Amino acid sequence: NQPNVVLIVVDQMRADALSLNSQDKIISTPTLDMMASQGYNFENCYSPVPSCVPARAALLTGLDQETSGRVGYEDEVPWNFKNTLPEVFKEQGYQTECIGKMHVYPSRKRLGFDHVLLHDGYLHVDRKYDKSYGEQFEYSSDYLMFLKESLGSDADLIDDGLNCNSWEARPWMYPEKFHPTNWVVSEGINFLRRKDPTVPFFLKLSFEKPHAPLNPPKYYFDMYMDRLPDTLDLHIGNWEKLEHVVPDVCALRGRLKEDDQRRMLAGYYGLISHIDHQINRFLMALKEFRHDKDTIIWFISDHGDQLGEHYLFRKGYPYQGSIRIPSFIYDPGDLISAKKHGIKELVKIQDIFPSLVDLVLGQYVNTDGKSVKQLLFGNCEGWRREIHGEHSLGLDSSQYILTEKWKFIWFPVKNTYQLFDMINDPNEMKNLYYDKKYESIIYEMKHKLVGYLKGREEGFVKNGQLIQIGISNIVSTL
Amino acid sequence: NQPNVVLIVVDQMRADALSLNSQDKIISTPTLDMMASQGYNFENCYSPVPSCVPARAALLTGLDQETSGRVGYEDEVPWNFKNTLPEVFKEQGYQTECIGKMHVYPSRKRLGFDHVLLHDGYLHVDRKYDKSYGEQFEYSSDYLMFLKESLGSDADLIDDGLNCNSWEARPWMYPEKFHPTNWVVSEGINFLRRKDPTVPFFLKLSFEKPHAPLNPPKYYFDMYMDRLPDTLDLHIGNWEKLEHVVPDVCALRGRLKEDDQRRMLAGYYGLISHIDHQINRFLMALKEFRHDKDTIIWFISDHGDQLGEHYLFRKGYPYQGSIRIPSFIYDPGDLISAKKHGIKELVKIQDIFPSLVDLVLGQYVNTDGKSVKQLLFGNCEGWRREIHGEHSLGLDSSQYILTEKWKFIWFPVKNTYQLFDMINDPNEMKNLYYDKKYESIIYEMKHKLVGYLKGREEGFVKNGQLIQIGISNIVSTL
Amino acid sequence: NQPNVVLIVVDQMRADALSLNSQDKIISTPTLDMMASQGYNFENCYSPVPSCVPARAALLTGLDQETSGRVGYEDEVPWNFKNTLPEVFKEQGYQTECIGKMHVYPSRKRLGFDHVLLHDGYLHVDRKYDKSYGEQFEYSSDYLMFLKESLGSDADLIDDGLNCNSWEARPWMYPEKFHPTNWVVSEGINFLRRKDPTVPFFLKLSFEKPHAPLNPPKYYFDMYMDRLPDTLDLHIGNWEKLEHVVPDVCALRGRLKEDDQRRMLAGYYGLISHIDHQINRFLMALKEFRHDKDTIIWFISDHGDQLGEHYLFRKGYPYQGSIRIPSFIYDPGDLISAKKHGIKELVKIQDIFPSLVDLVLGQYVNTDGKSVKQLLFGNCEGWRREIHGEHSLGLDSSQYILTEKWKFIWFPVKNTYQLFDMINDPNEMKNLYYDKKYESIIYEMKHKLVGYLKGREEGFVKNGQLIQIGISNIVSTL
Amino acid sequence: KNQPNVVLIVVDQMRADALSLNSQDKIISTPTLDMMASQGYNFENCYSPVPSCVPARAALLTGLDQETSGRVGYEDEVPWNFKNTLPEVFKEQGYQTECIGKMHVYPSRKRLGFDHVLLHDGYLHVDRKYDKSYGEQFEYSSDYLMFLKESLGSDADLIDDGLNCNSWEARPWMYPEKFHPTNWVVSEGINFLRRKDPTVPFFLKLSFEKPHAPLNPPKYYFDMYMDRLPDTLDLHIGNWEKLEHVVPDVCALRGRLKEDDQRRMLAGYYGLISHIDHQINRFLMALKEFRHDKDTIIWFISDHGDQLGEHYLFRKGYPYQGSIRIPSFIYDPGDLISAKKHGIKELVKIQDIFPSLVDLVLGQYVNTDGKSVKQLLFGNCEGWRREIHGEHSLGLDSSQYILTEKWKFIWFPVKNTYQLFDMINDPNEMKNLYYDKKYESIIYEMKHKLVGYLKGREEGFVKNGQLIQIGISNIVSTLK
Ligand SMILES: [Mn+2]
Ligand SMILES: [Mn+2]
Ligand SMILES: [Mn+2]
Ligand SMILES: [Mn+2]
């Protein structure tokens, strides 16, 4: 009795960009809606350190950021992990495959996958004309090589002029059939065709979208340009500061012209609805292989996107737009006997690894994350009450504690604080830190932060108190 | 210590078609906005003789129109200049390259560029079936040859029926990847790949757009057709005359149906937003070559476009639509220590040459233009108070003086005058010449014009006074 | 001194579908507008027998319908004419060429053209699987052969399902560059390239459009679908009868759903604006060959299209929609010394032949049509006051007299009459025949009809009076 | 004013006797080169003193002797710190300068006086390492390889048929003939003529990578030689060669091939040369289309020869005629040089091209080691050299030699062995004369010349006025 596993990873998808989680239901995600509502949808799933590299180290190893050391974004840091999610499945006799984005270093280090067909998207560390030929450009991306075999050697990832950290958006400029999202599913179907029939499979399907460039196929772009509402709400509350400058094309903060905000949403949502159709394609193929009833699917995003919310862009922030991720288990064969329903407790990306090994392999994994199995059966025994996350981001480096009621944030280089009522202010528009009615929570929350940060090399804590630090103390890896 | 230089030239782009300079902010130029606002934006930059050939002679040589003799448009006039912008950089050890439009004569005369990959757009003097094979059609344009290699030998520049001096507009009829704007950036990236690594580079990227034909890719055309405002303001004031005829398809004056005015703007703005994305592509490539921090970029247009304003089309007029050009230095490596800000003083296209040689090479150039270096540091010492420009245009030949307060225009074949308050009437809608309250300015302004024109071969001045001349006296080259 | 001549023929274009002639100015024909307004525009030009074959026999020979015998539509009738328009030019030393639609029989009979590159559109008599191979389908049309060489042998003229006599419409389903309208201009440019340089040319450029199928390129179709006015006026007056049935897809009469009427107009107008751009392409090429100033251009349509007006479709009717045609001389080299202006007198398609031979060759042609030369110089000496036209159309066979004030119509199989005031009722909405105030005109008009029809084989006249005839008496050729 | 254009045509690894005009048996088909060489000035005794690619191309471009440049053997990625080069002097004098094809310089895209270089160096190991810089490797190092990927698809590469660039193996080109690198050089030379600056004269280097291996000419030319090469192929084995009797390495420096392999190698090599010959004719026809056939001077040269199995030796880097003697001629159909056209028998070095062209065309001196051949063209031998000192590092077979108009004297300093050949009566070097005492006087003089050239060299060839054996670790390819 060994079920197959498909781990579907998308990059930079917000939790509220799953229509089921959304409040306004504008985004079209009919396939993911069905999957999440029919399985176990994690309504409170979080990427504690919300950017590509630290989130993916956490996904693969189950490790908290202090254990792995990945407290912010840094490329080309060694991945010295043996006990990884695909490695444990391999040890138990699975064929292990990854199609798409790994974002590990060295880029083709397999970390337990038998075989990897790699496309990390646009990575500056793989697109330098003076670095090693075999590790750069079309030799670093099997999708880009496919693009050159398909469109000719002159084709490249940047042909339409959109930057991978930019809010600029416009439709995919080539035939739709060559889009990277289709390619992941096409190659996932090729894996099903060509896999070893004598063993079960663990397959990671890892889409680089909806991470920019924001270039969905024209159909999906025009869909949203035609129907997005007239006014687009940025959830501007009582704490945001506008610097009143023309936005950098790769801005981390600021405000767009309304037309630019509209195009950004149409690109971003368009990429998501496109992923949704292509995942449905993969589901249809699973059925052609008679694997629709013996396979368990977990969908997750590595982190969110601020998308202009609070005058912020990109990620690496403590706010919900960055840290809250969509996440659900889809179990159409009913291999998990727990009653299917939405899960409210605080789940971390670190929990996926031990949950999958427990639920599918019936084994314990010694790591920081914890198996959600008991949550599925309605038992919050031993479950965390809070999450400590953080991210290095220069002046805007953050440290935060999230509970089911509060989010307490500290910016240690600025030495400023925020407090939000997550139940009544889910979009974090009302900073409460300066209201004396919350003096008790704030003192308790500061006390818990000392608990997490005492002893950290950056010097956050001196003599049991939180102290402003200089920007030179911030590191992305411990 | 030798920074690289990229000189980006566009053709027929209005100063107010850079969104940053625009008042209504309708045009989408997010990349150029960022570049101009982050560097030094010249808010008062002018092409004194506003058409292709005299402006480009001024750009390349720094010479005033009396010195070069190019007082209007004329093709196939010798370019007997040795002291040119690329030549000085070559002398100081730079590799010099031009991709795109030169508009010199002979067409492939290099004037200091080591290598030129040429595309002048549609030029009547290069598209005559009875002129030399090697200098005509696809042998005159390396872009057109690319088009024939890409689409087949039957492809040509006029396939969709749009004329290069016409207000008619419609989307590019072929796949977007073959557009001439993409080709300039593709070939600029090929130059970066293949350049001599032992020396710095001076690269001119010279787009033929947004000069007509007005055929942007469909995406950009539809963008504006969908969102341009309902009513399009032509700034019709108290002096324009409407001749009440069906407009010639290559008209120099008149009025369009509202739908034709809308399509013209959608074509023109669409070409500009397309250039903007493609420049962003080139910026991304500069970073892949690790040249994003050791390169100085100057963006400029050779002249503007009347675009229907004042019932005028094309260029060669004294009005702001023709003479005011977008122009800025982008310095992301902070190689220039002056505080970055907008520059208000009167800058001419003649100033680019000596400014670049001063700022980058630390040398003096003996020419008519002057280095803007001191302006960047806040010092208007020795700066001009006024510009004398002109253009031959038959009956509408003009002579004008522009200061920071006034524009005084004389049409010497018509022997009529205009006066505009540039501060309070920036769109030149209120001719003041017949108001007696301005008798003193007008007399002074006429006196200055005698100063500029006394001795000119056309006979503008007889016995110290300005006199009407016959049309046969007008010349385009002295 | 021999000017070149280009005769541009379009098929089924209404006179009021030239924007200059139109009242509402909705249709976009900027190139034709300029040509017609700058030359001599014939505001009252008529195809007396308004369908393809009889109009083209009249165009080529100058003969009235009684002389040629072509009083209605009939295919495969011999063309036993020696004295034709191209033949006279050939005799005077011209190279003669036709590109496009001839509609003669045998199809490749040249009738004075040195060379013909043929595309008659969809012709039922050339699309029969049991008729001669060499004269059918792709062997009858050099455009269709081009389509098979371009798209593959499976391509055909009917691939999108639109019928050549149908009001159904939709965009061209293939790449725009393969449209038949582009092909005429491409092949007209090939003729200019390859012509005999030692002699002048007479070139007929004969477009099959805007005759259905109504499949313009997508750009032009969407243009009108987006901007045509909400309500489309059919000019329904006091005489039309609605048969209240679902319209045949090739209906000669009836009423369409509003959406179908909108799509028909968007297809029809779209084809016309497309022709307009492609004619501008040909004008640009004429200039590349230095023939823009030594060439005289005459534009004409063979007949109109009812387009749903008066609950009528197609042509072959006596009403203005069918009989009034656009027609103008374009003379940018000013080879004709007459002052350029619009021409109001009644001109027939029979007049083109003798006008061109008189104006360009300085010779008399013995035919029924008359040279318009004196009209251009303001002299209506000897000019007709009236036109007698007609068409065989079963029950709706017609006979009519048109003057500058009246149109009098007789339907001899129905034996009904109509009378319209052409000055005050230009759209023929008020039948006056039953108003006693017009008894004198009507009696005179009936008397003139006896004059035209006495002796005709059909038996219209018996003992000096007009008499109802049976449908079996109607013929299309005498 | 009225300055002539110049085309320097360089081929790689072509033997002097693989020009039919120079050959004894006239088997190889080079009709176009025969015409140009016999109608112009053919250098019958032109030499590459250090016969491998990099030292010969340094000598060609700079005019420097191997001791001045330090290039005494093959070595990649040595800096080219030369300002005074052949294209630079023409550029300085107002010429547009262009190279299409093989430069073999370092860094690969250093222009060294060319306004523009369209680069194809052939197969170079230092340009084909997956761990070296992307923009300098494989299809980013070779504009021909990029053209092949654009033409055949990204799958295509330079080694698809399995032939090694240092190998005697041969077979026809496996792709359509129109994509061959020899055609590409001429196609792009025509593109340059189309797009050049019309206001200045041009200096154009057309640098073919062939007939250097892979030995893969188009099928037509391969079959031509397989169908008609003689049954017996002479290796010119004399009284001094020694066979090692091992299976030959596919990139062997010495040995003996099976008959069929030797025949295939000749068919590939000759086939490549006859193919170049047709493609150069193509270029001549294009020159006339641009009306430049009578205002252009052409100099054809090879950088060094190829042993081709002769004396049981392969490749190059040897002191024998197969390696050091190169075809070389000036073609001047416009009669821009007034000297009567004839063949030139005196000793000419590859170092002489640079000063000769600058003298003949520009009327200037260059301060280099080579000398202008102009006086020879006019029949004046006054002061012209009577000997050449050459050498090459090649491990145990490292050589030092003196070539005069009559003798070649060779010293192998690691083996401490000597050879002497009569170049008039024994032009194929089959009879070593060193051990015959009749020649002791000549040998004495030749050793004394070598002492003069080699005194003070860092390798320690000379001690107390005498040539002495050196250890192999003393051998270097570039002097310090
Ligand atoms: Mn990510
Ligand atoms: Mn211009
Ligand atoms: Mn017709
Ligand atoms: Mn070589």
Author numbering:
A (entry chain B), B (entry chain B), C (entry chain B): 10 to 487
D (entry chain A): 9 to 488
Give the article text.
In this study, we determined the crystal structure of an arylsulfatase from Enterococcus faecium (EfAS), revealing a homotetrameric assembly with a windmill-like architecture not observed in other known arylsulfatases or phosphonoester hydrolases. Arylsulfatases, a subset of sulfatases, catalyze the hydrolysis of aryl sulfate esters to produce aryl compounds and inorganic sulfate. Functional assays and site-directed mutagenesis showed that EfAS hydrolyzes sulfates, phosphates, and phosphonates, indicating broad substrate specificity. Furthermore, high-performance liquid chromatography–mass spectrometry demonstrated that EfAS removes sulfate groups from key bioactive molecules, such as caerulein and estrone sulfate.
The crystal structure of EfAS was determined at 1.96  Å resolution in the P4212 space group, with two crystallographically independent molecules in the asymmetric unit. Structural analysis revealed that EfAS forms a homotetramer through symmetry-related operations, comprising four identical subunits arranged around a central fourfold rotational axis—resembling a windmill assembly. The formation of the homotetramer is primarily mediated by interactions between loops and α-helices of adjacent subunits, involving multiple hydrogen bonds, salt bridges, and hydrophobic interactions. The catalytic center of EfAS is located within a groove on the protein’s surface, positioned near the interface between two adjacent subunits. EfAS exhibits a characteristic AP superfamily α/β-fold structure, featuring two β-sheet domains: an N-terminal six-stranded (β1–β6) and a C-terminal four-stranded (β7–β10) β-sheet, encompassed by ten α-helices (α1–α10). In our crystal structure, C61 displays dual conformations: unmodified C61 with its –SH group coordinating Mn²+, and HFG61 covalently bound to sulfate, forming a sulfate-ester intermediate (FGS), likely resulting from crystallization in the presence of p-nitrophenyl sulfate. Metal coordination analysis revealed that optimal electron density maps and B-factors were observed exclusively with Mn²+, not Ca²+ or Mg²+, which correlates with subsequent activity assays showing Mn²+-specific catalysis. Structural analysis reveals distinctive features of EfAS within the AS/PMH superfamily. While the active site maintains core features of divalent metal coordination through two aspartates (D20 and D311) and the catalytic cysteine (C61), EfAS shares the distinctive fourth coordinating histidine (H312) with PMHs and SpAS2, diverging from the asparagine found in classical ASs. The substrate-binding pocket of EfAS exhibits an elongated and narrow shape, delineated by residues S60, Y82, L132, H133, N174, R323, and K324, which form the outer boundary of the pocket.
